[PDB]
Design a protein around this motif. Structure first.
Motif, PDB file in Angstrom:
ATOM      1  N   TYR A  62      -1.015   2.675  10.647  1.00 47.02           N
ATOM      2  CA  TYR A  62      -0.032   3.369   9.824  1.00 47.02           C
ATOM      3  C   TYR A  62      -0.501   4.795   9.576  1.00 47.02           C
ATOM      4  CZ  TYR A  62       2.336  -1.034   8.912  1.00 47.02           C
ATOM      5  OH  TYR A  62       3.028  -2.213   9.043  1.00 47.02           O
ATOM      6  N   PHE A  78       0.780  -1.227   0.000  1.00 46.20           N
ATOM      7  CA  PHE A  78       0.000   0.000   0.000  1.00 46.20           C
ATOM      8  C   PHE A  78       0.817   1.285   0.000  1.00 46.20           C
ATOM      9  CE2 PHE A  78       0.424   1.681   4.282  1.00 46.20           C
ATOM     10  CZ  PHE A  78       0.902   0.596   4.983  1.00 46.20           C
ATOM     11  N   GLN A  79       2.144   1.228   0.115  1.00 48.05           N
ATOM     12  CA  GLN A  79       2.910   2.464   0.041  1.00 48.05           C
ATOM     13  C   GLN A  79       3.112   2.902  -1.407  1.00 48.05           C
ATOM     14  OE1 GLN A  79       4.713  -0.068   1.973  1.00 48.05           O
ATOM     15  NE2 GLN A  79       3.969   0.621   3.971  1.00 48.05           N
ATOM     16  N   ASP A  96       0.638   7.241   7.606  1.00 51.07           N
ATOM     17  CA  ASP A  96       0.797   7.791   6.272  1.00 51.07           C
ATOM     18  C   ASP A  96       1.060   6.639   5.311  1.00 51.07           C
ATOM     19  OD1 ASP A  96       3.209   7.186   7.363  1.00 51.07           O
ATOM     20  OD2 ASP A  96       4.175   9.107   6.941  1.00 51.07           O
ATOM     21  N   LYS A  97       1.510   6.975   4.111  1.00 50.70           N
ATOM     22  CA  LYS A  97       1.710   6.013   3.040  1.00 50.70           C
ATOM     23  C   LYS A  97       3.152   6.072   2.544  1.00 50.70           C
ATOM     24  CE  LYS A  97      -1.774   5.379   0.314  1.00 50.70           C
ATOM     25  NZ  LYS A  97      -2.029   3.928   0.527  1.00 50.70           N
ATOM     26  N   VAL A  98       4.098   6.064   3.480  1.00 48.82           N
ATOM     27  CA  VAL A  98       5.515   6.235   3.186  1.00 48.82           C
ATOM     28  C   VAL A  98       6.262   5.002   3.668  1.00 48.82           C
ATOM     29  CG1 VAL A  98       7.584   7.538   3.747  1.00 48.82           C
ATOM     30  CG2 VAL A  98       5.462   8.736   3.207  1.00 48.82           C
ATOM     31  N   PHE A  99       7.166   4.494   2.837  1.00 48.77           N
ATOM     32  CA  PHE A  99       7.987   3.346   3.191  1.00 48.77           C
ATOM     33  C   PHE A  99       9.215   3.807   3.965  1.00 48.77           C
ATOM     34  CE2 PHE A  99      11.603   0.599   2.312  1.00 48.77           C
ATOM     35  CZ  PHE A  99      11.124  -0.636   2.687  1.00 48.77           C
ATOM     36  N   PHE A 125       6.047   5.474  -1.951  1.00 47.28           N
ATOM     37  CA  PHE A 125       7.434   5.903  -2.039  1.00 47.28           C
ATOM     38  C   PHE A 125       8.076   5.729  -0.671  1.00 47.28           C
ATOM     39  CE2 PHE A 125       6.508   9.902   0.043  1.00 47.28           C
ATOM     40  CZ  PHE A 125       5.199  10.130  -0.304  1.00 47.28           C
ATOM     41  N   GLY A 126       9.357   6.077  -0.585  1.00 42.66           N
ATOM     42  CA  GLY A 126      10.103   5.882   0.638  1.00 42.66           C
ATOM     43  C   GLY A 126      11.166   6.944   0.820  1.00 42.66           C
ATOM     44  N   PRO A 130      -4.005   0.680   6.391  1.00 45.52           N
ATOM     45  CA  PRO A 130      -5.102   1.548   5.939  1.00 45.52           C
ATOM     46  C   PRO A 130      -5.979   0.826   4.929  1.00 45.52           C
ATOM     47  CG  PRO A 130      -3.087   2.174   4.847  1.00 45.52           C
ATOM     48  CD  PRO A 130      -2.714   1.076   5.807  1.00 45.52           C
TER      49      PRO A 130
END
Ligand SMILES: *[C@@H]1O[C@H](CO)[C@@H](O[C@@H]2O[C@H](CO)[C@@H](O)[C@H](O)[C@H]2NC(C)=O)[C@H](O)[C@H]1NC(C)=O
Ligand SMILES: *[C@@H]1O[C@H](CO)[C@@H](O[C@@H]2O[C@H](CO)[C@@H](O)[C@H](O)[C@H]2NC(C)=O)[C@H](O)[C@H]1NC(C)=O
Ligand SMILES: *[C@@H]1O[C@H](CO)[C@@H](O[C@@H]2O[C@H](CO)[C@@H](O)[C@H](O)[C@H]2NC(C)=O)[C@H](O)[C@H]1NC(C)=O
Ligand SMILES: *[C@@H]1O[C@H](CO)[C@@H](O[C@@H]2O[C@H](CO)[C@@H](O)[C@H](O)[C@H]2NC(C)=O)[C@H](O)[C@H]1NC(C)=O
Ligand SMILES: *[C@@H]1O[C@H](CO)[C@@H](O[C@@H]2O[C@H](CO)[C@@H](O)[C@H](O)[C@H]2NC(C)=O)[C@H](O)[C@H]1NC(C)=O
Ligand SMILES: *[C@@H]1O[C@H](CO)[C@@H](O[C@@H]2O[C@H](CO)[C@@H](O)[C@H](O)[C@H]2NC(C)=O)[C@H](O)[C@H]1NC(C)=O
Ligand code: NAG
Ligand code: NAG
Ligand code: NAG
Ligand code: NAG
Lengths: 366, 237
Positions: B25, A265-266, B27-30, A268-269, B181
């Motif tokens: 989680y 579900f991500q 946010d949506k950041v690795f 970017f990093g 999420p």
């Protein structure tokens, strides 16, 4: 420029710092997800039957990607009339809950559908606001909405007590009293029916043929907008200093393949101090790396203008591949300090006089 | 189709220990092998969480809902201010097939419920549905406990979910598991209260409230949150 920085006409033996080399981006790329969820406009534009002018079909539109280019280039439609929004910029503008009002009318009265316009059906059947933000599309349908014996299935409102407010749909069928006596449901004196049928015929001339007319109304209220164009994307390039706009996340750098395993579900990093390192293209759904384009100062190695006149140049901390008047010069040497042009590498070893770095240094013989 | 229910079932409003559950989680950041400090809305550690064995409950800012339900008696949810056609309202239903999310001016009775006949079909939650604004359908969600986090910020309704097999009898297990999420909805409702839906034949769940505070999260190599620490509980923290 060594002399210019030193502000002297004679220069002593050594190594001196100068301007900073930096690579520049070449072109731009943009990536957006697969254009899907195409907005269902065929169901309202290629419907078999349309409603009457007094009972026009009203439809709401939301949560869809609307392709207005096809209608823009659609040669079948004749009337593409509107002034509130420029027709070619619809794809750029983004709205929510677009309204579609469709019907069939006579060819002569197609002008009545306009902001601040009056007539027979404009103020009786469908009225437009003076600040209309939309666009009306109309086209002939004589071959479809007419009968050789006469199309009598379409009716229009003719007599009303008052006018019609904008964006109002009145379908009441009640007798009209045109005098000082009640009709009591009798078509007597001063009593006329408000609805009259159309007389469409295939042999009828221009202006008497049935025209299918639909207006699109664009509204943008406090809730987030959801209906707009496809946001075309470019293709993908790698191993080149470019700048990118990955799904709204924009920046410069060079991209390569990566082996990171994003959780499903991500997008970017980043590592630390808010520095993006990896992205996922919204079409291939694969992880790509990002590294900044090369930069670093340059230095000049000289034996002193008193002794000789030729120099050597060092690009520190730069890979010996993006070297580029001294683009070629002499044989180019690659060391842990950077790339060196204008010097010859040997296998001997002497004392150090002009320290370069990483355990190597240079001297004059060449 | 529904009237006042004479059988006023009593679910005792007990209190129990939140332990260290309710982490999602943010946010949506690795991120990999890094310790990140973030300030946001969370459920404070070791707090009183209400346990019921269908009262009206306030929404406050966000809601942590949990149920170790078996045979899936829990059905859906109602959200809004007055839960009437006079005001815009939201409804979630999770039946056997695809889940349905609705946003309209629905009118419910005093006791909305689903009921089943033994042929398994009955639906009398509401009375009327006149003005509609949003519709959506998705895949069905579902010894095993289901946890959800509901937030409503900036016309965005966010649902986070997680289901895990359980073996303990009564209390919440003392383990840790982040909440991924699940869904986001672009609809704005000034939700103030909410409700619940059951499957009656023709019941224990836990509720907690969120607060703004600061947490510290630890990410593993693959980017999965594996442990967290509160910053306002104990001096050691
Ligand atoms: C986005 O659309 C493109 C255009 O079709 C897809 O590219 C091909 O899609 C077919 C069918 O889905 C695959 O069999 C091919 O292997 C794809 N080509 C590739 C991957 O080079 C692409 O798969 C779509 N991606 C998503 C995420 O929908
Ligand atoms: C400068 O960049 C080039 C290009 O990547 C590097 O050359 C690579 O070196 C590795 C390690 O031996 C090889 O596996 C690759 O196949 C090489 N690629 C190419 C295109 O030659 C080079 O190593 C870099 N400079 C330094 C000092 O590392
Ligand atoms: C679950 O509820 C839906 C309605 O909320 C029932 O009917 C479906 O309704 C949708 C809406 O148009 C249709 O597209 C589906 O074809 C309907 N049937 C399905 C999803 O099977 C549905 O029957 C209910 N499922 C049950 C009772 O098992
Ligand atoms: C049906 O409900 C929708 C959403 O609740 C209404 O749409 C907007 O409602 C807000 C409420 O404050 C108004 O400010 C907007 O002007 C409304 N916009 C539009 C385009 O109507 C809608 O008005 C409701 N319709 C009915 C008949 O109750
Ligand atoms: C939630 O309630 C607030 C009021 O506290 C609403 O804000 C009002 O919105 C209307 C409609 O645009 C305005 O005319 C008022 O001036 C606003 N008042 C304030 C104090 O901001 C808000 O729109 C409501 N939101 C939802 C989703 O219902
Ligand atoms: C995190 O990702 C790593 C890398 O894939 C996982 O390690 C693999 O686990 C599988 C299943 O046991 C093994 O077959 C592979 O040999 C492992 N590879 C490596 C490089 O270790 C790991 O399971 C994932 N999860 C955790 C919690 O580390
Ligand atoms: C209606 O059909 C015609 C004929 O194929 C097509 O050109 C047009 O795009 C269709 N309209 C819509 C809205 O798709
Ligand atoms: C140049 O350097 C040499 C020794 O390296 C010295 O003998 C000579 O005088 C210098 N010339 C000048 C300073 O003009
Ligand atoms: C001498 O140096 C050159 C490059 O400067 C190298 O190619 C060569 O192999 C070296 N020979 C020996 C014997 O070290
Ligand atoms: C819950 O509140 C009771 C008092 O009503 C208290 O005794 C108990 O310790 C509390 N539990 C918590 C805060 O976890």
């Amino acid at each position: 420029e060594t002399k210019c920085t030193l502000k002297s006409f004679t220069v002593e033996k050594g190594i001196y710092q100068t301007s900073n080399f930096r690579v520049q981006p070449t072109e731009s790329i943009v990536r957006f997800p697969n254009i899907t969820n195409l907005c269902p406009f065929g169901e309202v534009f290629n419907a078999t039957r349309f409603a009457s002018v007094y009972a026009w079909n009203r439809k709401r539109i939301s949560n869809c990607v609307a392709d207005y280019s096809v209608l823009y280039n659609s040669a079948s439609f004749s009337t593409f009339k509107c002034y509130g929004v420029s027709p070619t910029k619809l794809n750029d503008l983004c709205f929510t809950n677009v309204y579609a009002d469709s019907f069939v009318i006579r060819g002569d009265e197609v002008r009545q559908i306009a902001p601040g316009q009056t007539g027979k059906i404009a103020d009786y059947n469908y009225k437009l606001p003076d600040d209309f933000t939309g666009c009306v599309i109309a086209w002939n349908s004589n071959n479809l909405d007419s009968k050789v014996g006469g199309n009598y299935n379409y009716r229009y409102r003719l007599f009303r007590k008052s006018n019609l407010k904008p964006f109002e749909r009145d379908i009441s069928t009640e007798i009209y009293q045109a005098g000082s006596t009640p009709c009591n449901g009798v078509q007597g004196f001063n009593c006329y029916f408000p609805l009259q049928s159309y007389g469409f015929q295939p042999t009828n001339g221009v202006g008497y043929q049935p025209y299918r007319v639909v207006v699109l109304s664009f509204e943008l209220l406090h809730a987030p907008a959801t209906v707009c164009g496809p946001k075309k994307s470019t293709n993908l390039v790698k191993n080149k200093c470019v700048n990118f706009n990955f799904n709204g996340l924009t920046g410069t750098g060079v991209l390569t393949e990566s082996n990171k395993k994003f959780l499903p579900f991500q997008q970017f990093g980043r590592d630390i101090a808010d520095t993006t390192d990896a992205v996922r293209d919204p079409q291939t759904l694969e992880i790509l790396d990002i590294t900044p384009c090369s930069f670093g100062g340059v230095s000049v190695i000289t034996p002193g203008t008193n002794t000789s006149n030729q120099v050597a140049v060092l690009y520190q901390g730069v890979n010996c591949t993006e070297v580029p008047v001294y683009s070629t010069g002499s044989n180019v040497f690659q060391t842990r300090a950077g790339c060196l042009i204008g010097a010859e590498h040997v296998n001997n070893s002497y004392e150090c006089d002009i320290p370069i770095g990483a355990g190597i240094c240079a001297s004059y013989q060449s | 189709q529904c009237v006042n229910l004479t059988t006023r079932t009593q679910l005792p409003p007990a209190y129990t220990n939140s332990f260290t559950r309710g982490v999602y989680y943010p946010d949506k950041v690795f991120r990999s092998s890094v310790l990140h400090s973030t300030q946001d809305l969370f459920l404070p550690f070791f707090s009183n969480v209400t346990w019921f064995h269908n009262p009206v409950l306030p929404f406050n800012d966000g809601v942590y809902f949990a149920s170790t339900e078996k045979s899936n008696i829990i059905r859906g949810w109602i959200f809004g201010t007055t839960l009437d056609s006079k005001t815009q309202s939201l409804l979630i239903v999770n039946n056997a097939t695809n889940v349905v999310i609705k946003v309209c001016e629905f009118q419910f009775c005093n006791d909305p419920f689903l009921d089943v006949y033994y042929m398994k079909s009955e639906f009398r939650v509401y009375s009327s549905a006149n003005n509609c604004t949003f519709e959506y359908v998705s895949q069905p969600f579902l010894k095993n406990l289901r946890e959800f986090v509901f937030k409503n910020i900036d016309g965005y309704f966010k649902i986070y979910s997680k289901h895990t097999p359980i073996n303990l009898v009564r209390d919440l297990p003392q383990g840790f598991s982040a909440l991924e999420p699940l869904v986001d909805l672009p609809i704005g409702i000034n939700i103030t209260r909410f409700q619940t839906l059951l499957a009656l034949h023709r019941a224990a769940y836990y509720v907690g409230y969120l607060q703004p505070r600061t947490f510290l999260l630890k990410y593993n190599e693959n980017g999965t949150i594996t442990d967290a620490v509160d910053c306002a509980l104990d001096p050691l923290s």
